[PDB]
Amino acid sequence: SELLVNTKSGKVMGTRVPVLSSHISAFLGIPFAEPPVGNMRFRRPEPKKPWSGVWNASTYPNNCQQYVDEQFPGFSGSEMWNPNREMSEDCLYLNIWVPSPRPKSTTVMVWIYGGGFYSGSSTLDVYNGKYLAYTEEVVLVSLSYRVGAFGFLALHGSQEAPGNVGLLDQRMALQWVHDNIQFFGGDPKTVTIFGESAGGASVGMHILSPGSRDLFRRAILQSGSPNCPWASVSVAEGRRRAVELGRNLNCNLNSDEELIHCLREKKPQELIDVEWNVLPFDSIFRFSFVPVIDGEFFPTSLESMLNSGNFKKTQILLGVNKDEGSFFLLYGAPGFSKDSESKISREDFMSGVKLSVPHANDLGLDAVTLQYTDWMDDNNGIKNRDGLDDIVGDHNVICPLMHFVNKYTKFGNGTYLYFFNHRASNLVWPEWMGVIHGYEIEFVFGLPLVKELNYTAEEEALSRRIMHYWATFAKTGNPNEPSKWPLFTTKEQKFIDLNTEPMKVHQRLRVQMCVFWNQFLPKLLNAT
Amino acid sequence: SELLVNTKSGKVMGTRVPVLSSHISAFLGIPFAEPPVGNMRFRRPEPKKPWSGVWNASTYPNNCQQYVDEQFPGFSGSEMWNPNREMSEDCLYLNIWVPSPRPKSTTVMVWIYGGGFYSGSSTLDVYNGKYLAYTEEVVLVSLSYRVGAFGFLALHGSQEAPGNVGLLDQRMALQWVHDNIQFFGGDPKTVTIFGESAGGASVGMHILSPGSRDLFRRAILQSGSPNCPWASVSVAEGRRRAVELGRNLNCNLNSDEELIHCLREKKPQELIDVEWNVLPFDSIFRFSFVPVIDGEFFPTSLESMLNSGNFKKTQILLGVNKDEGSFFLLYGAPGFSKDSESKISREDFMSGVKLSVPHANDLGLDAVTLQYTDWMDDNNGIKNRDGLDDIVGDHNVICPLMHFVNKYTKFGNGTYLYFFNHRASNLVWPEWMGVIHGYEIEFVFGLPLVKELNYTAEEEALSRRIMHYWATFAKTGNPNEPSKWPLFTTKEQKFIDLNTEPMKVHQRLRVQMCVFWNQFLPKLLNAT
Numbered sequence A, B: 001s002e003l004l005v006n007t008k009s010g011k012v013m014g015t016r017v018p019v020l021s022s023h024i025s026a027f028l029g030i031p032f033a034e035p036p037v038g039n040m041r042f043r044r045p046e047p048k049k050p051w052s053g054v055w056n057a058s059t060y061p062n063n064c065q066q067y068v069d070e071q072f073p074g075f076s077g078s079e080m081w082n083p084n085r086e087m088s089e090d091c092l093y094l095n096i097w098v099p100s101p102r103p104k105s106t107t108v109m110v111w112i113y114g115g116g117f118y119s120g121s122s123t124l125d126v127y128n129g130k131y132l133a134y135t136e137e138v139v140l141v142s143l144s145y146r147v148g149a150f151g152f153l154a155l156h157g158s159q160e161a162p163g164n165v166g167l168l169d170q171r172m173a174l175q176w177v178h179d180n181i182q183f184f185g186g187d188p189k190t191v192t193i194f195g196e197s198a199g200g201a202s203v204g205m206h207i208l209s210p211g212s213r214d215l216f217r218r219a220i221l222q223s224g225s226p227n228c229p230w231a232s233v234s235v236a237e238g239r240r241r242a243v244e245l246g247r248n249l250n251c252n253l254n255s256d257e258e259l260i261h262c263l264r265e266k267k268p269q270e271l272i273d274v275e276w277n278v279l280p281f282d283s284i285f286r287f288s289f290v291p292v293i294d295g296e297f298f299p300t301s302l303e304s305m306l307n308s309g310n311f312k313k314t315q316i317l318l319g320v321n322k323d324e325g326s327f328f329l330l331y332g333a334p335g336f337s338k339d340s341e342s343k344i345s346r347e348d349f350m351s352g353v354k355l356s357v358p359h360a361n362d363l364g365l366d367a368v369t370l371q372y373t374d375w376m377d378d379n380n381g382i383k384n385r386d387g388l389d390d391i392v393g394d395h396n397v398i399c400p401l402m403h404f405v406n407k408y409t410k411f412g413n414g415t416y417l418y419f420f421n422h423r424a425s426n427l428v429w430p431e432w433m434g435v436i437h438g439y440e441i442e443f444v445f446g447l448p449l450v451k452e453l454n455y456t457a458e459e460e461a462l463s464r465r466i467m468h469y470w471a472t473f474a475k476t477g478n479p480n481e482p483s484k485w486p487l488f489t490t491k492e493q494k495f496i497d498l499n500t501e502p503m504k505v506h507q508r509l510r511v512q513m514c515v516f517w518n519q520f521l522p523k524l525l526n527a528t
Ligand SMILES: [NH3+]CCCCCCCCNc1c2c([nH+]c3ccccc13)CCCC2
Pocket: A068, A069, A077, A078, A081, A114, A115, A116, A196, A197, A276, A327, A331, A436, A437, A438, A439
């Protein structure tokens, strides 16, 4: 049978699923690591023991323990990101969509979910791999990894909670893909890892990390890069946050063994309930437990690695959305709300910039404010709102990605850059949020192909263009079929827009603002 | 006779002069102070001893000892500013143009020449007061004052060279106007002092200085304000430069008495020959001997005086030209030259910004560079040139003037602001210099009224508009005759353009750049 596959870990049994009036197979919930429960919580992942018999892979696995969004109860805009499965610490599984008939050796795509390293699931409807697997004839894999304290509590020096285990979870799933995708018709020498937000940052972290490089061929990063200001912390800050977490749960804080033992005795929801209480500043776009620059997974600082070319050299395709910051201001900056146009006053503008560049002094805040204020119309509420929005996006996503792409291209073997600015005809979010963080995903996964979802015909056309660029790129190292998406070069720095209009090529994506965030502000903060 | 006037200092005899096919009287070369020669060099001015007999006032007086421009020998563009009279330390005279028939009690205008406090003359053809006196029926006075070391050598604490004597020269001439203009038909209660560049800075200094305020009614400032970065120095820097001047002339430097005695024994050209050797930095738009914040003429710092409203409250009319900085880059920045378009490279751009903000550290230079570079076209030579030009103008003239006008309007009784951007049809300077520092003067003095000078008919029309605005303002406190030049207010901050086109009203003249130069850069330099 086409739904039975024998892997190096045991036999697994899939299920047939319908897609655009046809069908393909799906192997949902395959385990790739032993459940990280009990004394295993916080430890690096251990490889799944093989099993005799047949693993039932017909339904989605549980989602990892995580904080759940409740701002807009029942609002699809936000519920679509919450776990749609029971949560459990037993959550290290992967899902595989396989074209029918089963391929022999075709292109493989592995999706790594985003969610600021504190949330996320591989089972969300927007991550359904069936449309992409089917339309492009690729074997689509989506892995999972521990988030929050479970995946990133870091007490450097300890082997019980070394930090970065969530990344190691991902690596293990990738080790599994490399070792077994052939039995599902996948070509292990042609796997592309792609992810969005923390997923994009993760992809870049596997490009950097020596122990991950050999496990994949190419990479795609959506709205995220490894050097993002919110994606990593030092071992010290990591230690400081683990201790503070312990202090919140009334733990014994005399030794790492004492802290970890206490944290391991707490129920999942107990750690989640106080997780946010450990951030060092009042901030927007900052998360508690994230990857650490430990000297192991990351041999040295990210910047020196990027500067010395100490990373995997291959092709990469990546990009950003127009209004990456809107959602973060909606959730945490005063003056913004889901049901108004959110015109912001000067005072709220200013308190918003403070919230956005948490690590800046006064001189630094003035610099940012000056850089984003139209001084001959300072009380224009639409302008204050939009200016604040660009600040969040530029600082947290765009400029960090631009710095990564410029450093990468100096040593890489091919770069393709995009700027996704199509505002979906069926968006349920207020118009002021524009092209939101996370909303290019639905096009990458092909939702506009299903009529019931209500997209326009041009939007469906856009999704097919994107799906085919991503798949053609994963398969060849070039999104183009032999209108050309130009290669981004250190000299020309070209990129394309990605919407329903005829492709336009541009150059130096947000240079003006990014020279400010990548060169001036750091130098200014380092001297004061 | 109409050419004879009896003053409190003695009788004086004028000469009749032709103007636009008519005639008026002129009293040229009237002394208002004893010659500041010998042991008097560097001392405050002493009032002229009255004379019996008749003073021959039919010819222009000598010009004060000063550095003479020789960049473009015989080039009118630059020669028009050099002294057109023999130079001499005996130079404290004033010139009066009187309408014919002699008025009874009409509006008085006193012109104070510019020239960076190191040069200038009251006898230049562009300062000929006959056209203005005649056309507007005002008694036009032009004074003179010691420049260079002669007028501003400052060894604070000493009474032999206290500093600011050049300003005191001006005050004395104003004291004279106040005491004697009535005999020439002038209304001593209706005198307006107006000046350009250092002259404009001087006008503002008389508004600030308690001992000068009662001597005039209103004020006009052209391309200059008292708080300009090049218009004053501290007593320390002043002292430091006097000593360095002495060290250049091989003087004995053991005491003020020793230094001054030596400096007084040197010939005028000896001090002029080494005058530039004392600037503390490699700079553009900086001059050796300028006014000092001494605690006497200026009771406290200029900024605190402006902040506390410690100044003369009256009406003021003032403004700037579009390309104030061009001439300074022509004369001292690498890459600029009189006969090319001066497209500048990035390197020359950068060395130009260093030269322009002499007192800045590295962080400061980066800030300026970032603020003035179009980062998606950084190698555009026209852009680098123009960006550099605005930097000089914004920092040295425009933003300092905007800061002065905003502080002044908070306490004043009426402000009128202009932006002069007409590029004269007969300009002999290369087109890249635009509307040059000093080129609104010819319109204020009416040169476009004389056909031989070759202006267009619209330019002549512009000059009459300007002459009448200035005169109507001096006479009433309002340039408008009862298209309206709006009053500049703290709230609206309106100003007008001044060219051959229909008046357009605008708001917040260069706010964007000026918030940078008046608030950000200072704060940034003060923290690093
Ligand atoms: N106490 C502060 C905690 C509140 C934070 C909870 C918000 C949940 C975040 N959920 C979202 C994600 C993404 N886009 C959006 C866009 C809009 C709203 C929510 C999200 C793209 C990447 C996956 C996650």
